[PDB]
Coordinates of C-alpha atoms (C1' of nucleotides) and ligand atoms in Angstrom, one line a residue:
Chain A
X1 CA -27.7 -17.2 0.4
X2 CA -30.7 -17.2 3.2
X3 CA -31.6 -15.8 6.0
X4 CA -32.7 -15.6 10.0
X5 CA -35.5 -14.0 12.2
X6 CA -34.9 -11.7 16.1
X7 CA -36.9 -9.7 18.0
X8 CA -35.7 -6.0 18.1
X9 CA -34.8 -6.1 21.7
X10 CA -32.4 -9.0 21.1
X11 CA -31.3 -9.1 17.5
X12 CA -27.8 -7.6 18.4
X13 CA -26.5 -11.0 20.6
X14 CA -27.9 -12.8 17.1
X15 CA -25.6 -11.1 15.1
X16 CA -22.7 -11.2 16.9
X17 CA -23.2 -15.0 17.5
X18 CA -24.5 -15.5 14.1
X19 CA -21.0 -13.8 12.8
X20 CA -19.0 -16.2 15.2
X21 CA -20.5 -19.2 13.1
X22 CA -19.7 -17.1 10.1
X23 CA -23.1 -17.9 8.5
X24 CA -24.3 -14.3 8.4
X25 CA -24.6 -13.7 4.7
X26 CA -22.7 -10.4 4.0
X27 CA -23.9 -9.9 0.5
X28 CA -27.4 -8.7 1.2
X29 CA -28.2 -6.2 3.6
X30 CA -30.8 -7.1 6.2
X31 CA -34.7 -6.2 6.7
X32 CA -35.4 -4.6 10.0
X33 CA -39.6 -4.4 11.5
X34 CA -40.6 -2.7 15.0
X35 CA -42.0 -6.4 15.7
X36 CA -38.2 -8.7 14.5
X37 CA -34.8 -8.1 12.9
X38 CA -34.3 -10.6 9.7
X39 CA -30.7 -10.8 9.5
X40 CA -29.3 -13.1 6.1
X41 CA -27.5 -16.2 6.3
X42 CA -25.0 -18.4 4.4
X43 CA -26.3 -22.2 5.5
X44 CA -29.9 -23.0 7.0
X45 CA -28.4 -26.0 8.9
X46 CA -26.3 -24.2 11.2
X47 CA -28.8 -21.7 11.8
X48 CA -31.2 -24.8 13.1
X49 CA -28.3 -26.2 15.0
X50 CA -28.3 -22.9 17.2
X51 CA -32.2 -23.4 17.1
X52 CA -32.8 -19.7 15.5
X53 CA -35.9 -19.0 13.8
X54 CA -35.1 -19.5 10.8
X55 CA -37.9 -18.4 7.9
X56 CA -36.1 -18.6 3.9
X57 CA -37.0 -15.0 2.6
X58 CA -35.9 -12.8 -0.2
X59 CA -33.5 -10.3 1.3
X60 CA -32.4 -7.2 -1.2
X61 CA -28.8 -7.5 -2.8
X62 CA -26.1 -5.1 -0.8
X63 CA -24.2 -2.8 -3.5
X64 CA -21.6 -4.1 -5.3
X65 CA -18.7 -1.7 -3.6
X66 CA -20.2 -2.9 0.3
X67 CA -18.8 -6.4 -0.9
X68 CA -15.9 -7.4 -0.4
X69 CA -14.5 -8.5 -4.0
X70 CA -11.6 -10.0 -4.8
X71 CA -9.2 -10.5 -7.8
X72 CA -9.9 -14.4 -7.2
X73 CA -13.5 -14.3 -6.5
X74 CA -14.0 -12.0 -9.4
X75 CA -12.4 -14.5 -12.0
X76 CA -12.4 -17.6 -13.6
X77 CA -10.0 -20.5 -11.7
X78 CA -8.5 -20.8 -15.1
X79 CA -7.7 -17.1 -16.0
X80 CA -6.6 -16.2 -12.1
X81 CA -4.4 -19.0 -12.1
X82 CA -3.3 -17.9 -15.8
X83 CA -2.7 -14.1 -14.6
X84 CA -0.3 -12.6 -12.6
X85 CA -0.3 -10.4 -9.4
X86 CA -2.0 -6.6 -9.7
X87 CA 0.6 -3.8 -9.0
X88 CA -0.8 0.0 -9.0
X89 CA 1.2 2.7 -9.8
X90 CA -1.0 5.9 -9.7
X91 CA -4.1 5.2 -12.1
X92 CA -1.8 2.6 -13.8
X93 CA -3.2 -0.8 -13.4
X94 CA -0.1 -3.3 -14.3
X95 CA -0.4 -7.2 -14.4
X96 CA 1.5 -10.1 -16.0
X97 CA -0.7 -11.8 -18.6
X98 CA -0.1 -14.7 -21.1
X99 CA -1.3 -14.5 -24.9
X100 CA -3.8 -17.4 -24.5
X101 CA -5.6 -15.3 -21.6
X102 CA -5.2 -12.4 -23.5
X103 CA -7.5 -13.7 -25.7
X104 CA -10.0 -13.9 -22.9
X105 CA -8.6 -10.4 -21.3
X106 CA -11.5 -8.8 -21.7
X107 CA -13.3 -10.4 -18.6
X108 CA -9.4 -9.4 -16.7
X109 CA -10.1 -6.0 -17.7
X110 CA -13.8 -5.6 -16.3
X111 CA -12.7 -7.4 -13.2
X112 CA -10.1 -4.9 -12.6
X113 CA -12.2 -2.1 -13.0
X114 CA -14.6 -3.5 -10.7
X115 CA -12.0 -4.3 -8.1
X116 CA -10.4 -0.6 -8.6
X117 CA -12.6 2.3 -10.3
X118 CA -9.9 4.9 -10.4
X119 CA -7.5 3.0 -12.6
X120 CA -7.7 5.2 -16.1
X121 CA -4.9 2.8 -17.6
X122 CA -4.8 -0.5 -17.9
X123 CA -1.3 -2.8 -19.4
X124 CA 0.6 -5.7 -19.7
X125 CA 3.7 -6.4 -18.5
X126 CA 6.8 -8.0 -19.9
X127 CA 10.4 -7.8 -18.0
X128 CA 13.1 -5.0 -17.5
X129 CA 16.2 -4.8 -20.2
X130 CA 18.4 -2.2 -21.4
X131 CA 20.3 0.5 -19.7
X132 CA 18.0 2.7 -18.3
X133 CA 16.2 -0.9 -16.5
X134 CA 12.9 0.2 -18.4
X135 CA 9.9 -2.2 -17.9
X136 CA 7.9 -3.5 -20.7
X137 CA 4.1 -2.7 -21.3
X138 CA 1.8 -2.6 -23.7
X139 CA -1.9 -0.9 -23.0
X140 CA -4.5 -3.2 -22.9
X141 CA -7.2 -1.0 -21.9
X142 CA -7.7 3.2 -21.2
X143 CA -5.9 6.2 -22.4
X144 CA -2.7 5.2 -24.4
X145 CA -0.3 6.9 -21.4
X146 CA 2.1 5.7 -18.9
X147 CA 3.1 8.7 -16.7
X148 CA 1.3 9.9 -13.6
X149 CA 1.8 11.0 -9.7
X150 CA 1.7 8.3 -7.4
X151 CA 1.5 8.8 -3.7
X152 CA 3.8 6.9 -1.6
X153 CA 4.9 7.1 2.0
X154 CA 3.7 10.6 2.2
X155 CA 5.4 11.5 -0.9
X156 CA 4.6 12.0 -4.6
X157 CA 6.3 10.2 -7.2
X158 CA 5.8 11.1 -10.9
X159 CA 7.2 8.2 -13.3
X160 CA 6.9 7.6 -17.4
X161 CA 6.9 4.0 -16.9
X162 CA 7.9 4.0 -20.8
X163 CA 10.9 5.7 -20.3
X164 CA 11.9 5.4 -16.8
X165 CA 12.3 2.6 -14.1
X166 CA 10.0 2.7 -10.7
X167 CA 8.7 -0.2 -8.6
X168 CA 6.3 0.3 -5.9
X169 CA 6.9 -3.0 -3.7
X170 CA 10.3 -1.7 -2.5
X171 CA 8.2 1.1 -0.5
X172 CA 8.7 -1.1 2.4
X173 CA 12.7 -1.3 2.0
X174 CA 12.8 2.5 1.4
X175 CA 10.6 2.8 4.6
X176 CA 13.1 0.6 6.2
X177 CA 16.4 2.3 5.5
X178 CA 14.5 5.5 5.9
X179 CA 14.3 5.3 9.7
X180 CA 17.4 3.7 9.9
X181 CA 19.2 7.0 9.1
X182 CA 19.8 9.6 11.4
X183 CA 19.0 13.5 11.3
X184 CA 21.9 15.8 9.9
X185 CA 23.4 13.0 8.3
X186 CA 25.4 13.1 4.5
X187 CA 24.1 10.3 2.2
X188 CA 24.8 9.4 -1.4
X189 CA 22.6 7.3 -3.7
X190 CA 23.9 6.1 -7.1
X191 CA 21.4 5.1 -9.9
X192 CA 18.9 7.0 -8.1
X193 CA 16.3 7.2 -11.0
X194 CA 13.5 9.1 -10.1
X195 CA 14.3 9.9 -6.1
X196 CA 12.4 7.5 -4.8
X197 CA 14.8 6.2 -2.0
X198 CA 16.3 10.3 -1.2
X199 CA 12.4 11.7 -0.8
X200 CA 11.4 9.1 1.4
X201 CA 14.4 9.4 3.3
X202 CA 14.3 13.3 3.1
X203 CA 10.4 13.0 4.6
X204 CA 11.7 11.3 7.7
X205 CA 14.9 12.7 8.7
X206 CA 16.6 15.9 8.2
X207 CA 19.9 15.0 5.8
X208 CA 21.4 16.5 3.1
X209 CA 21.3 13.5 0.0
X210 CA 22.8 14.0 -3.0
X211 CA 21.5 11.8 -5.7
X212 CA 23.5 10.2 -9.4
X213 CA 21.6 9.5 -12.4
X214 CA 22.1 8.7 -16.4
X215 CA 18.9 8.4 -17.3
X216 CA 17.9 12.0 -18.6
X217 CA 14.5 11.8 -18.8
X218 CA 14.0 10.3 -15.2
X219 CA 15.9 13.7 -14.6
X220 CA 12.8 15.9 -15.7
X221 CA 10.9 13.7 -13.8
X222 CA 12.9 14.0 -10.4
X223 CA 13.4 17.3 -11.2
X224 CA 9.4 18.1 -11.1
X225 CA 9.3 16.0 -7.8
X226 CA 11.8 18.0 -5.9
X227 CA 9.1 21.2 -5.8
X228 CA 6.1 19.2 -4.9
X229 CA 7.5 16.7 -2.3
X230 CA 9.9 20.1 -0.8
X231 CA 7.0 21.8 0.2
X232 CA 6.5 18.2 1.9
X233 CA 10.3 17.5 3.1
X234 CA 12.3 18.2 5.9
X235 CA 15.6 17.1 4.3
X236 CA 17.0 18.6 1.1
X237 CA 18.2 16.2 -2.2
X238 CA 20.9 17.4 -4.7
X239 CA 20.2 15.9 -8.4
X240 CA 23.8 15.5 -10.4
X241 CA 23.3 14.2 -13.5
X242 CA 25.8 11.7 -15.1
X243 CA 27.8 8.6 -15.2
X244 CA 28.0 7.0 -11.4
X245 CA 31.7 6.5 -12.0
X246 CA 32.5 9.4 -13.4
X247 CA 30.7 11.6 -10.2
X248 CA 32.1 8.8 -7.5
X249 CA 35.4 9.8 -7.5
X250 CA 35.1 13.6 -8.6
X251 CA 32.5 13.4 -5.3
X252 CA 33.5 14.0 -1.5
X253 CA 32.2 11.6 1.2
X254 CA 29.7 10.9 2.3
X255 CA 28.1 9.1 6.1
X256 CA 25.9 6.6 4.2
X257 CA 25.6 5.2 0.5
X258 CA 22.7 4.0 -0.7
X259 CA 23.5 1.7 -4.0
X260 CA 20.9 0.3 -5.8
X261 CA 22.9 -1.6 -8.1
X262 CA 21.6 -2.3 -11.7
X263 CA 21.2 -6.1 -12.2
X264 CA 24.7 -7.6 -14.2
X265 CA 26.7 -4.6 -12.4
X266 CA 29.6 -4.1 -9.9
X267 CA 29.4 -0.9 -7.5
X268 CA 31.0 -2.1 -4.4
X269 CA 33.9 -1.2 -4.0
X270 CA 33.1 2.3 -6.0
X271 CA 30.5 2.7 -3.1
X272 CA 32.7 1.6 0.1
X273 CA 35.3 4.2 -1.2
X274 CA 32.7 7.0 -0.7
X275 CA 30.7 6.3 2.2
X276 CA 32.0 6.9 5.7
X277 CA 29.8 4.9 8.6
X278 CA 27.5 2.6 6.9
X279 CA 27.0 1.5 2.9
X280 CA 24.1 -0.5 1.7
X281 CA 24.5 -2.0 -1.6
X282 CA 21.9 -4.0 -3.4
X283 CA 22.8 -6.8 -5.1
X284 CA 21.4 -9.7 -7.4
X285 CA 22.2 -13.3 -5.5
X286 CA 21.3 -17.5 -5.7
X287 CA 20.9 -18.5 -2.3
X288 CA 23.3 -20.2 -1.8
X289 CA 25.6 -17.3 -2.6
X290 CA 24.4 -14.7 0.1
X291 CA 27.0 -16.1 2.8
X292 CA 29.5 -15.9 0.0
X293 CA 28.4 -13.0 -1.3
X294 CA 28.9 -12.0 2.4
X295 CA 32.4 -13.1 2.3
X296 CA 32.8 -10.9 -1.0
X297 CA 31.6 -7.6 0.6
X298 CA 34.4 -9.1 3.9
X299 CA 36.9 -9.3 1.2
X300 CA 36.7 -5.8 -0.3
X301 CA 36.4 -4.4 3.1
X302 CA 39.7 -5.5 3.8
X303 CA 40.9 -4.1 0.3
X304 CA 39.5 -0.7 0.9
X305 CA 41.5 -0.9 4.4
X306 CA 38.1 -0.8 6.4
X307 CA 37.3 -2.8 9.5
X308 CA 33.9 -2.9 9.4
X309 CA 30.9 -5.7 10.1
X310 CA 28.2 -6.5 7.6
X311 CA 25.1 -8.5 7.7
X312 CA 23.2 -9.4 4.8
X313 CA 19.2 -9.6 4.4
X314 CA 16.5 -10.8 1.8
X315 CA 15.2 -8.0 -0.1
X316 CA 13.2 -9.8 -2.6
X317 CA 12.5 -12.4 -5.3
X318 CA 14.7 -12.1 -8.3
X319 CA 14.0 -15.4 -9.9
X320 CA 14.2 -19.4 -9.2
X321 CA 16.0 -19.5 -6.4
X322 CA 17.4 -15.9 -6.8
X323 CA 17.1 -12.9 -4.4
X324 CA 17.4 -9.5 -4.9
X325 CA 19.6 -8.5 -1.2
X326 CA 21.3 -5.8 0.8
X327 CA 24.3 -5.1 2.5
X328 CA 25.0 -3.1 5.2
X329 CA 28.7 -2.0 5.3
X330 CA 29.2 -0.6 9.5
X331 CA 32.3 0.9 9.3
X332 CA 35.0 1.5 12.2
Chain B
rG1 C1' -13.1 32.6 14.6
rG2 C1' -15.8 31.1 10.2
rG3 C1' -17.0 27.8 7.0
rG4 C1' -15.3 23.4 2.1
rC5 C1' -13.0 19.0 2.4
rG6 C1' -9.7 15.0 4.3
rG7 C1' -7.9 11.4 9.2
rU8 C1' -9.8 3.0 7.9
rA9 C1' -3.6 -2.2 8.1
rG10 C1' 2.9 -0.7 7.0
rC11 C1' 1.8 2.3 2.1
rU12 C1' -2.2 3.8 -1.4
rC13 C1' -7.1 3.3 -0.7
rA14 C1' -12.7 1.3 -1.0
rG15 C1' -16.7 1.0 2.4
rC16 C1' -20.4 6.1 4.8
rC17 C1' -25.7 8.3 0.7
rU18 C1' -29.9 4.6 3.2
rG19 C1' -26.7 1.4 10.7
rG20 C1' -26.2 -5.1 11.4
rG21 C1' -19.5 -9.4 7.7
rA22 C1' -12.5 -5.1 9.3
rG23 C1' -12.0 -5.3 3.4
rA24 C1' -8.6 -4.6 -1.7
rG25 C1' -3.8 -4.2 -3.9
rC26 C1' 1.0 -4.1 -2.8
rA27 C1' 4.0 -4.0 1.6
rC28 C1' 5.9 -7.3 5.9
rC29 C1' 6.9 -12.6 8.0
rG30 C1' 7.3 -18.0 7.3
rG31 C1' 7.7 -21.8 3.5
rA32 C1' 8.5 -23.5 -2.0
rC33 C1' 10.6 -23.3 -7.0
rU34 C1' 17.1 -24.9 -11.6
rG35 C1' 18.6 -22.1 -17.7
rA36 C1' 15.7 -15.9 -19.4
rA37 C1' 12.7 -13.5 -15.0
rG38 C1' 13.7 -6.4 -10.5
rA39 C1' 9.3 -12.7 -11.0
rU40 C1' 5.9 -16.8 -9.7
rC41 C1' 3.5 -20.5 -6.2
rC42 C1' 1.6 -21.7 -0.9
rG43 C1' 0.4 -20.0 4.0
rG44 C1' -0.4 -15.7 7.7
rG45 C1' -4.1 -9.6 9.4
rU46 C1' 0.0 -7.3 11.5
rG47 C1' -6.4 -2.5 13.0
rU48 C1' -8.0 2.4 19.2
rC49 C1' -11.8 3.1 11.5
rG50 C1' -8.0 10.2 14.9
rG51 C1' -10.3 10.7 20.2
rG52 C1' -14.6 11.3 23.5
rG53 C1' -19.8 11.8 24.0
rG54 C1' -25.0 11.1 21.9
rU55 C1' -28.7 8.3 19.4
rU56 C1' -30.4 3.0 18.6
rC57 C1' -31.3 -3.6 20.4
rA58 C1' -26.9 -2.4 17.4
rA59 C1' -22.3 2.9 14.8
rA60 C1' -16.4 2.8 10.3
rU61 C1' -21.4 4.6 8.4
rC62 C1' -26.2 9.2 11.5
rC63 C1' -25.4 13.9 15.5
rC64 C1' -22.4 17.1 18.7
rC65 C1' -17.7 18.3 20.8
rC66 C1' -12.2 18.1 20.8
rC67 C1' -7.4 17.2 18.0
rC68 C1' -4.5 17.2 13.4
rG69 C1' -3.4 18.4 7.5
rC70 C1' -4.8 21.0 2.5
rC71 C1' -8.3 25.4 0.6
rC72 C1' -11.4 29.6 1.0
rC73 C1' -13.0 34.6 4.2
Ligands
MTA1 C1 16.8 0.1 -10.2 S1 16.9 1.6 -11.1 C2 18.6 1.7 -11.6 C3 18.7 3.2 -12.1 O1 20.0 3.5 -12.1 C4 20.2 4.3 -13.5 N1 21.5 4.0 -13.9 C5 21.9 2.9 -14.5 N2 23.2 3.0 -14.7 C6 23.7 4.2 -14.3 C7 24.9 4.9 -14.2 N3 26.2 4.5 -14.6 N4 25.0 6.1 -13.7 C8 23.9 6.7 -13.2 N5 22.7 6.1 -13.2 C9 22.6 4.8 -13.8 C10 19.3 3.9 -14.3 O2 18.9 5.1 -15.2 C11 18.1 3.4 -13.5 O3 17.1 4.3 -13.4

RNA sequence: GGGGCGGUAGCUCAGCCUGGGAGAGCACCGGACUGAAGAUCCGGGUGUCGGGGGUUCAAAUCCCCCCCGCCCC
């Protein structure tokens, strides 16, 4: 926290070479005179190695939202390394926290608030169970609500995180099969949810999708996201509501299947029965598994009478030594 | 044509009032971790701030023009 001294003719080579030493001090914005520029600085030692005059002034404090906070810089060493990573969801502000910081939580909460302003809801997080793959949370802070839009890949998502399933980090992986599709193509996704996986498809290609679901609720939900995101699609989505296995075989094929498998269940070979040129199926796998879980998908590719080649990628973390991962039937 | 707003990383966005650090979260890539975990830990910015001009010593920030998306005549 200090500061520098440059003529006005010449105080733009300072900063730029002050700013390649790094000591320009960022949190306080800098006085400017027709005679000198005072810029700030982090370390008077440096600024003397470079021979700049160098005078120790009081320079004003730059507003908070100019700087460039950060979940670690805005907490304690103890409670960061206590709490988990921050994932948004609309105005929903979720994070993993123990009880011993949740004691403490309060300080979390104001340093979320000053990292994010927009964030209404604030709640802990606890792990997915049951059927409908539901997440845990309690509200720690903000209105007592867990349902909102929430914009994603030029789409909008609404989601009742308390009785529905959604996770944003797999954006990337809908982004990625997204453009792997093709335009006029015939896809089917099992346990769709929500459509998270068909509307970002459906924005980037023109396809007819079809899309399974149990979970009743999550169809209201999907149901009000098919009017705002079709003034926003090119592609069109079908919603059939019901048991996967029960629609699979009462179903005509389809190009591509999309099958985000619940965790603890089998939908391969339901899958590769439907889909026609390429299947990805989403599985739960230890690492050392994903070549024999390759061998697996193999295996029922030569049940279902299909000569096809598969490759196998990383989706996620699961767990210890356990990845969430895809497969990518290519059918001949 | 007119005006009201928006165009910043791959997505969602701060920053602009009042000029001087290209940032946040997640994504993505590489590494690590044995019981339950749609996790967690370590490392990495991947950028034409829509484009051009103007002003100033200096523009993501102030001015004009052009392009593109929502809303009003
Ligand atoms: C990762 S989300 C898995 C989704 O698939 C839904 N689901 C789970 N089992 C079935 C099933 N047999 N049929 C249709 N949808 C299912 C659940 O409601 C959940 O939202």
């Amino acid at each position: 926290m200090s500061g520098v001294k440059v003529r006005r003719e010449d105080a733009k080579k300072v900063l730029e070479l002050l700013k390649s030493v790094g000591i320009l001090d960022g949190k306080r914005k800098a006085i400017r005179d027709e005679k000198y520029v005072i810029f700030p600085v982090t370390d008077t030692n440096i600024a003397k190695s470079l021979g700049l005059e160098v005078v120790d002034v009081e320079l004003p404090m730059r507003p908070e939202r100019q700087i460039y906070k950060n979940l670690e810089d805005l907490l304690p060493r103890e409670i960061f390394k206590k709490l988990g990573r921050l994932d948004i969801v609309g105005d929903i502000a979720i994070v993993s926290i123990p009880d011993e910081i949740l004691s403490e939580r309060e300080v979390i909460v104001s340093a979320i608030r000053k990292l994010y302003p927009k964030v209404k809801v604030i709640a802990r997080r606890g792990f997915h169970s049951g059927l409908y793959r539901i997440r845990e949370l309690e509200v720690i802070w903000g209105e007592n609500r867990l349902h909102t839009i929430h914009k994603e890949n030029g789409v909008l998502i609404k989601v009742d995180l308390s009785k529905v399933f959604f996770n944003p980090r797999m954006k990337g992986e809908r982004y990625r099969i997204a453009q792997l599709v093709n335009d006029g193509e015939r896809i089917l996704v099992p346990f769709a949810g929500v459509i998270p996986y068909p509307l970002v498809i459906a924005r980037f290609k023109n396809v007819e999708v079809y899309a399974v679901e149990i979970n009743e609720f999550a169809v209201k939900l999907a149901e009000e996201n098919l009017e705002l995101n079709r003034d926003r699609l090119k592609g069109k989505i079908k919603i059939i509501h019901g048991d996967v296995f029960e629609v699979l075989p009462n179903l005509p094929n389809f190009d591509r299947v999309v099958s985000p498998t619940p965790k603890g269940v089998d939908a391969l070979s339901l899958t590769l029965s439907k889909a026609e040129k390429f299947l990805h199926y989403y599985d739960f796998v230890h690492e050392s598994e994903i070549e024999r879980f390759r061998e697996r998908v193999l295996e029922e590719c030569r049940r279902q009478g299909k000569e096809c080649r598969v490759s196998v990628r990383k989706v996620s973390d699961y767990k210890p030594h356990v990845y969430k991962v895809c497969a990518d039937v290519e059918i001949l």
